[PDB]
């Protein structure tokens, strides 16, 4: 019954998460900067579908996650998948102000979001999050903690003890990293709050993005994988 996750040390937790990190995938190598709604959304949904497969295998490597029942694992991923893709995108984009790095060979700006109706609002929110992270000097070790928090938190109140204990451990891990980086006591709790408040915005972006994906599904122009469709359908 007892989970190995809770027995790990801060450093062990950080190392485990860094090691679980999925690879950065590429888009298609066609030189045509996507201008159509179809080609644009086609590239993004293709990418999202491939990313999802790596995400599912990444989640299994987050300490405490495999200790949940299959049903609980399904529930958490169904609730969090888009938040997780978005925070990953924002992280990748951090060093490219004004740009979203969907893939190393697919770096887009807000002008291209206009191609897809309803996409520019979402692009703008993602860009704002990226900028905020950049100005906060978000570190990779902090990012992996935040991403795991999203996985465990987003669906937890729609079912607990185990998940909340693991969440506490990740909090401990976040503070550990901030103290390790030389932050004072006041700076530690302030930075912890600043980071967790951004998770509220990420939830908001996910909700808006899910509505956009739904409208895309009803328009029936862009091909959506069965996996992407099932993940979308979970949000009713």
């Amino acid at each position: 019954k007892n989970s190995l996750a809770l027995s790990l040390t801060a450093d062990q937790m950080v190392s485990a998460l860094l090691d679980a990190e999925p690879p950065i995938l590429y888009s298609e190598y066609d030189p045509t900067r996507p201008f159509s709604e179809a080609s644009m959304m086609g590239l993004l949904t293709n990418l999202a579908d491939r990313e999802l497969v790596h995400m599912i295998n990444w989640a299994k490597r987050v300490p405490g996650f495999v200790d949940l029942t299959l049903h609980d694992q399904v529930h958490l991923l169904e609730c969090a998948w888009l938040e997780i893709l978005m925070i990953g995108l924002v992280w990748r984009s951090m060093e490219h102000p004004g740009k979203l790095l969907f893939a190393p060979n697919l770096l887009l700006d807000r002008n291209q979001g206009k191609c897809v109706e309803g996409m520019v609002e979402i692009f703008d929110m993602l860009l704002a999050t990226s900028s905020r992270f950049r100005m906060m000097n978000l570190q990779g070790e902090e990012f992996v903690c935040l991403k795991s928090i999203i996985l465990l938190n987003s669906g937890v109140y729609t079912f607990k003890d185990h998940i909340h204990r693991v969440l506490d451990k990740i909090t401990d891990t976040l503070i550990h990293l901030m103290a390790k980086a030389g932050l004072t006591l006041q700076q530690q709790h302030q930075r912890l709050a600043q980071l967790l408040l951004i998770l509220s915005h990420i939830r908001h972006m996910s909700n808006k993005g899910m509505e956009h994906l739904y409208s895309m599904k009803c328009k029936n122009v862009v091909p959506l994988s069965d996996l992407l469709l099932e993940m979308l359908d979970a949000h009713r």
Partner: peptide, 10 residues
């Protein structure tokens, strides 16, 4: 039946 079920077990 969900594809996610399968992927989480594979």
């Amino acid at each position: 039946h969900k594809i996610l079920h399968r992927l989480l077990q594979e």
